[PDB]
């Protein structure tokens, strides 16, 4: 992605909280193909640090079973994009999020192929409106989708 | 699906040979989920009868091997609505075609709640024009698809 498809001055600590994943869509189908896709994760909470990194608490299915992870991803020199510093490196890139309703972003494997990117329309509460369906609808118009999920 | 929203004079002996199944999308995501999920079979070949009826060669995962199926779409009272008559029952619902590019259809399982339906872009040969997955994304705005895969 470039630099200027991410979210120009995010505070990392206004995003603090609940979130609830609404939707996914991915570069690549078998990034997001069975519930055991490595990037088939539903977001929980965003914790930021004081030190500006950012904790991500996932749910995963995992056996049958719906675990929990908790994942750093670390500040980088490019404000909205983070660093999850694993032996397998991923990085975490915010589209745009108005704080108080929805949040965008994406997952980026670079150490693979191509561009094997996942991104997921985030929204802070159930209710019953598709502003930020809508603005991930055109988010994702720039890029080459090849999955793309819905929930309910 | 209601009487007017699929194919008009259809004839079906013209749809006959090699298909290829472009693209995918469902009322429900456990539809196409994984690789086994049911509806989710991958379209070779068309072959009406001479009685009018409709013979489908499929490629569906199963175990970790390609397996082919056979199944017959018998006709109905109403033009470009098939049934498979099997013990869970099944309409193939022919929504457009130019018999010469691209071929749209859905399946639907009227035996389960709502509305489970799941519909496919076909098209007779690889070649690289979008004017198939244009024509999908339009017959399926009136739809609420949760899950849209795309093939390479």
Known sequence: LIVTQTMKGLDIQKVAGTWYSLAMAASDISLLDAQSAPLRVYVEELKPTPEGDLEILLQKWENGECAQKKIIAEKTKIPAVFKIDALNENKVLVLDTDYKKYLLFCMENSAEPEQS????????????????????????????????????
């Not at 019953?128 to 118009?141: M, R």
């Open 117 to 152: 990117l996942a991104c997921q329309c985030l929204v802070r509460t159930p209710e019953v409106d598709d502003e930020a369906l809508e603005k991930f609808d055109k988010a994702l118009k720039a890029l080459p989708m090849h999955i793309r999920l819905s929930f309910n």
